[PDB]
A paper describes a structure:
Here we describe extendable linear, curved and angled protein building blocks, as well as inter-block interactions, that conform to specified geometric standards; assemblies designed using these blocks inherit their extendability and regular interaction surfaces, enabling them to be expanded or contracted by varying the number of modules, and reinforced with secondary struts. We construct twistless helix repeat (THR) protein blocks from identical straight α-helices (typically 2–4 helices in each unit); the length of the blocks can be varied simply by varying the number of repeat units. Restricting helical geometry to ideal straight helices with zero helical twist in principle considerably limits what types of structure could be built, but this is more than compensated by the great simplification of downstream material design, as illustrated below. Using X-ray crystallography and electron microscopy, we validate nanomaterial designs ranging from simple polygonal and circular oligomers that can be concentrically nested, up to large polyhedral nanocages and unbounded straight ‘train track’ assemblies with reconfigurable sizes and geometries that can be readily blueprinted.
To generate straight, linear THRs, we set Δθ to zero. This results in perfectly straight repeat proteins in which each repeat unit is translated but not rotated relative to the previous unit.
Residue numbers in the entry:
A (entry chain B): 1 to 201
B (entry chain A): 1 to 199
Write the structure that this text describes.
């Protein structure tokens, strides 16, 4: 429980200290080891009956640790970290659903992961921004369907949807016309998914 | 978390074995000691960061333990256990809301408690039935408002409302005409409560 979280954050901080300003090829291996250590600790918290708030805490700590590795590195590494970050965010959201988490805690973790991806796209170039926008939209769809399965209200589902739609618009503001319509098609698909999830609710 | 539940259930079972068919007057004190021990363990699970499923398990175990004391006793004791059972269920529902539980788990615990009260009105007189229904309607309102605070959907909220309204109609069935209109006044007040929460 509380003992599992302390051991996990200690391993994450030590993993984060390594390969940070120490090599791109090593940072990718360290990040995959950081994401695996987080995934095992999340599954461990689920087995031992931990609160959803502890699960959110450990998950957010891991996502921010991956975020720091992606920023100070190249765009090739940033896309690799963002794919790892979104996959870890999926596992954490699935764990919260199995642990019986509230809609609000699912929204919090989802927003933390969406802002982290947005933080990578704004810092990078235009081709990277489109790659992050597609990753962000897929993760947003996963979170919206997790909220639906958890019993969330249309208010919170529409809330998480707007945050993801705003994040996609925020990427297009600092881009050319070619990037705008490449994000506009992503926005229409995410609005379609959000409309379907809300109609079932 | 898992360590707290095992110690609590062992205390509840031993407390239940005592005064089960064992004196009524002691059973009421044992039941108050039973609900007090469960309420302290539920607060303990919240402080140590326990999962909502562990809180539901311990709460349902305590509610059923009270249910056993109420059935093999008299109607006066059955009403006393039902008030204790409803108060404990309210604490457990609030603990679930503070712990970050899902709306489904809140609905599950609420239904367990509403059925436990209905089972006490079962095989009881009409005077006890009306007293149980008033307790059931109040606990139903508590659970519905907790569901709203937890971000529950209209489907889950309307589902819990249907269960509570159906439970009131089951009490009216096989009852006197004087009991039916007494339940009918309770049904209409729970209906507007559900409409206000659903809006």
């Amino acid at each position: 429980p509380k003992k599992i979280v302390k051991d996990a954050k200690e391993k994450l901080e030590k993993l984060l200290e390594d390969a940070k300003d120490g090599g791109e090829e090593l940072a990718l291996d360290i990040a995959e080891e950081l994401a695996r250590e987080a995934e095992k600790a999340l599954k461990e918290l689920l087995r031992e009956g931990a609160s959803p708030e502890l699960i959110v805490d450990l998950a957010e700590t891991a996502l921010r640790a991956l975020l720091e590795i992606a920023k100070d590195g190249g765009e090739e590494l940033a896309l690799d970290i963002a794919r790892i970050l979104a996959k870890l965010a999926e596992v954490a959201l699935e764990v919260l659903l199995k642990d019986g988490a509230s809609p609000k805690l699912i929204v919090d973790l989802a927003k933390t992961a969406l802002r982290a991806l947005l933080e990578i796209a704004e810092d990078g170039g235009e081709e990277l921004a489109l790659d992050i926008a597609e990753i962000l939209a897929e993760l947003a769809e996963v979170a919206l369907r997790v909220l639906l399965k958890d019993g969330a209200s249309p208010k919170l589902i529409e809330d998480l949807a707007k945050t993801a739609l705003d994040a996609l618009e925020e990427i297009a503001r600092d881009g050319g016309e070619e990037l705008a319509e490449d994000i506009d098609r992503i926005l229409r698909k995410l609005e379609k998914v959000a409309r379907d999830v809300l109609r079932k609710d």
